Structures are given as structure tokens and as C-alpha cells.
Design a protein around this ligand. Sequence first.
Ligand SMILES: [Cl-]
Ligand SMILES: [Zn+2]
Ligand SMILES: [Zn+2]
Lengths: 350, 349
Amino acid sequence: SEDFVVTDRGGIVENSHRVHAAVVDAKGRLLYALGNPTRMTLARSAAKPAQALAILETEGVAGYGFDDADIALMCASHSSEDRHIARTRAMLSKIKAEEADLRCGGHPSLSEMVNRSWIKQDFIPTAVCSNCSGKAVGMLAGARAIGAGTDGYHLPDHPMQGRVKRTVAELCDLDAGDVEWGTDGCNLPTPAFPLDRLGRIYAKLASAADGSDAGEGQSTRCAALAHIFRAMARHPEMVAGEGRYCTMLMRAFDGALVGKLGADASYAIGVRASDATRQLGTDGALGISVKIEDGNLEMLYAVVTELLERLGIGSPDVRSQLASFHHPQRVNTMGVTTGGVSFPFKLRGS
Amino acid sequence: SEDFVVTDRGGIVENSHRVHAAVVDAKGRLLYALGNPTRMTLARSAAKPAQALAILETEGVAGYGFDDADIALMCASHSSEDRHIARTRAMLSKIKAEEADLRCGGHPSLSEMVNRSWIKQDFIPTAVCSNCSGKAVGMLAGARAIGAGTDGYHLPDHPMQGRVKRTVAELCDLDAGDVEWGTDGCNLPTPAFPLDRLGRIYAKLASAADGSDAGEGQSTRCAALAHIFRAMARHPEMVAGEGRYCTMLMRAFDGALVGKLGADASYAIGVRASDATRQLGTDGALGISVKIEDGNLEMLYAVVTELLERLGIGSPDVRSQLASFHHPQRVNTMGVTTGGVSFPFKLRG
Ligand SMILES: [Cl-]
Ligand SMILES: [Zn+2]
Ligand SMILES: [Zn+2]
């Protein structure tokens, strides 16, 4: 319950960060934990697959012809690379909308390399550049498809947001009153719920992929969840971008899992059934959710990668692709290694 | 104890950050605390006034003619503004040295506005651009004055670093073995010691300033501490830069205190004796030191400003120049405020 990731300088403690984590089975039963696995947590962008489900289940959205890469962008916190802007624009054209219809705003890119190119060009990002631009187009598409107004598609009382709110609570297996709502950076409602339920959503994503693969009689919702999983795993560069953790993680695993960042250092992973998950004592898919209490992203990726190693998910060779995130560099202005990162926590079985 | 600073989104907890703080008198006695006031803590750049004391006490350094603004730069984590870089180069000429003699490296500017300008220009920062460049020149100056060699002035076995290590321990009133050492971003040794002792250093700085102003006879060390305090308070723009917390804090207080940032979210302040310090129960100067356990700088500045308010240091008018740091903006991409910062901590005496 007192689980930390700790950085040091010469073996002297620099910073410490409290970790919360839940590892759950396909029905949401808690298998392993760090910290408080039920911590009430703002899922932020890690809720995007659930919002994408609400979009995909909206009557008429199928008629726009969104493809897997478009769905991956709905699920993205992308780096605002030119390819992400181009896909956003292509999605707007599918619904006969324009950039002025977006209700999210521009921001500095999540990628330092993109941001430096923008600074060099004096480029001011606009709505089409938002990391949430794919979700925004999807919400616009849903509003248009049912003949709702589009001007306020992001407002809490709009029917698209009522659909989102209902869909999030159903995927979490929670009553409406057990999900709290704030406003996100992109100006949409954003949910908070117990951390283990974030893992449950991702377990359900990977379980649906397994059941699609196995040729089971799936509900339309399970079919849609399987589609979302497949889309993210097939187009992981749309979900984040070059050099980004989510993209590198999903590329290394080549369809065995999906992963997604939430702002302020949450992370979620859906893991398809494998020899590794069977060794962990479950017969189906699993979900992992993590929150770093103080919000540090570098520590989040270090911890997530350490957790994958402790859980035996992947091979050493596969996980070696994430080495730069697992043990972040601590090299000073003269090339000297001054410190490191340590994981003095123990996963508890529960 | 459970002392935190917390951010929320619509009243829903986002992040929480553990706070440690010590408020000490001029002899280091603990008056108030948050968290663990004796946490072993890397002082990082908050140690720079102690390193500047080691430089200024090196025999021969007075002959180079460093002025108060040069001393303030020795005490700095500057933003690498053109005035900082230029002063570093001017300081090198005072000691007949070149940039190739420095043993620190460049890095992206601590100021976003400066760094944006560098990106637009394809500027590559070099040693004189380091936020620690003034300290580096001072260490090189002391090595030149000693006469034993300058190539390794930054190495632990060099007499300049032996002087630094002894001086830090003496100011903390610690045995050498109770101060631990790592290596800083600039490649110099950097000390760790209990957090309250960082407060003690800054209490001694302010106390020396009080004695000097009152005309008391002082030891050579106290006279040098008073000089460091004066230099920081007279040239706060050299200590950090435009828009930076340390500069805005020291300007607002107009000589009543000095403050300094350490990397990974430590902060130290030395407060000259005043009605406010007397209300806190001490008859001399005060020191304050703070560490945010997880290293978040935005939260550090919010907590330091909140602590000054709780201690009654300044006036609402003086502290209001720090309002942007006290309650950081939480405005989204559409201009809407989405939450804020709160301070569920409780000072203990
Ligand atoms: Cl594409
Ligand atoms: Zn968003
Ligand atoms: Zn330094």
C-alpha cells in the first residue's frame, strides 16, 4: 500500500512518486495491485476508447465510412504530426464538416520535435491540431448522424454527451452517480471513476478481441470493442506518434495488447489471453491501469514498463524496445551519468 | 504527518504532492514544520550561496574585482538571457580565462521564452550559457588564486571542492559525514543534508545582513555572508531572470529577504529580522526551506507563496506580485478554467 518509484542522484534520494495500479480479469476481478487500486481517478484520454464506442454505436455513424485508422485517431492523444492533421481533415470531409465546427482548441504539441518545428515556423496551432481532434470529429459525426445540433456537441446536456456518459458508466459496470465528471483540456466532459474500473474497460477491449478472433457469438457492443482494439493495434502511430510510448509499446507487442496514456499520468493496457496471462492465474484477457499520484509522465512510463516485466508480459527482447522509458536517462551536461530510477515496490496478489 | 498540495478538476482530485518544510531561527532551532523537516535532501542550486561563500573566502579572489552583480551570478540559476551570458564572458576576462576552461555544459534555457528564441535561431548553448555558469567562473577563479591547477577545478579531490565541502558542512553545523555528495547537472559535486539545515544556511545569511546593517563587528565569514545577501537582493535579475520566481520574489520584498530555487523542487529563503519574524516567536533572522517530494516546480512556487502568507511575511500588497504562482492558472484550450490548487497542509509549531 506504500508503493513508490524513486529517483536518485549518486544513490541519494532525489524524488519519490506514489504508484497506484490495478490488474484485473475480464470481469473486473482484482488480481494484483499497487497502492490503492480503487483510487477515484480522472481517466482523461485513457477514457477515449469508451468515448469512441459511444460514437460508433450512434445511429447512422456507420454510413460515414470511418476506417480503422480513423477509429485509431478517435482513440488518440496524437502528437499533431502532419499525418494526424491530414487524417483529421479527411474525417471532417467524411461528415461534410469544417474545422470551424470543431469545439476543441490548439495547444503545444505533445511531441517536442513537432513543437520545435512549429516554433521555428512561427506556427500557431488551431483546433484541427488538438491531440483530441479525432475524438472531436467523432463527436461531431455522432451529433450530425442523429440530426442533433452540432454547435454544442461538447456540452454536457447535448444528446451526444448523454450517450458518452451512459456508455462510460456501462463499460465500468457502475451506476451513473458513481461516475463523476469534470471538463477536459479539449473542453469536453471527462470522467472520474475507481482506477480498477479503468483496467476493467481495457480488459473488456482485449476480451472482445479474443472473442472476435475465436468466432464467438458477440453482441454488437463486443464486436465494436473488438474493432476498437484492432484499430488501435493496427494503427498505433495514429494513437500517439513517432517516438511516443503508446506507439512503441503497441508496435513492440504486434497485436498482443493495446495501451493508452491519460494526461496527469494515468495509463491503461488491455492484454489478450496469452501464456503470460494464464501464468498469472486467469483464463481470459486482462486489464492494467496505473496512476502516478503526483502526475509525472516520465515515472509513469518507467513504472508501466517495470510492471510488464514483473507480470511477464512479452519477452525480454520485445520489452527491450522500451528500454529508454524503463530506465530513463540521467546524464548531465558533460555526458556523465548522475543517477537512476528504482522500483522498491512489490506487487500484491489480491 | 499528511501535508499535501493538491490540484483538482471540477472539485475532483487530479494530483497530490507531499510537502516538507522547515522554518528555523538564526541558530537553526526549529520553529515550524510541514512534513518531515529533517528529510535528507539534495539542495541542488539552493546550495549556491554556500558555494559562493567558499569562492569569496578563497585567498586572492578579491584581487579579480568581481562586483555585486558578478556575485549574484555566482549565486544564480539564471535563464541564460543575453545579459547573463555576457556577464559570464566578462567574468572570464577578469580571471584571464576562456570558455574552454569551464567544466560545465550548455542545456536548454530554464526560461521558455529564451528557449523559444534559441529554437528559432538554431542556437546551440555552450558552457557560458549554463544556468551554473557564474558558479563555474567563480570556482575557476578560486582555483587560479590557489595556484595548483585549473583543469580539474570541478573534481572532488581538487582543493576548490575540498573548500566547498568544508564550507557547506560548517554552515550546516554538521560533521562531514552527515553531508552526502552527488554530481550536479553542471558536473560539480552537490550536497545533501537534512532539510532544516538548508533553512539554517539562509537564516545565517539574513542574520549576517542584519549585523552588517547594524554596524556590528563581524568575523570575515559573517562579512562575506552579508555581502552575498546584499548582492542577491540588489541584483535579483542575475539570480534568475525576467518572469522568474526568485527574481519577482526578491524584487517584491525589496531587501527584506533573499530566496533561491533548487532543481527538483527545493526552495530556500532567508528573512531579515522584522515585525513578522518577531510575531513568529524569534528575536533574530529566520530561514525557510521547502521540498516537494515528487519534484514538481509549479507546486513548489504555489506552496512557498502560501507559506509566506501563512507566516505573515510581507503584506498582501507585496505578496500579490506572486499571485500567478500562488494560484496557478488552470485554463483549457478554449479559455475555460477547469480547476485549481489547494493547500491541505497544516503548519505545526
Ligand atoms: Cl495516416
Ligand atoms: Zn480530450
Ligand atoms: Zn551547478
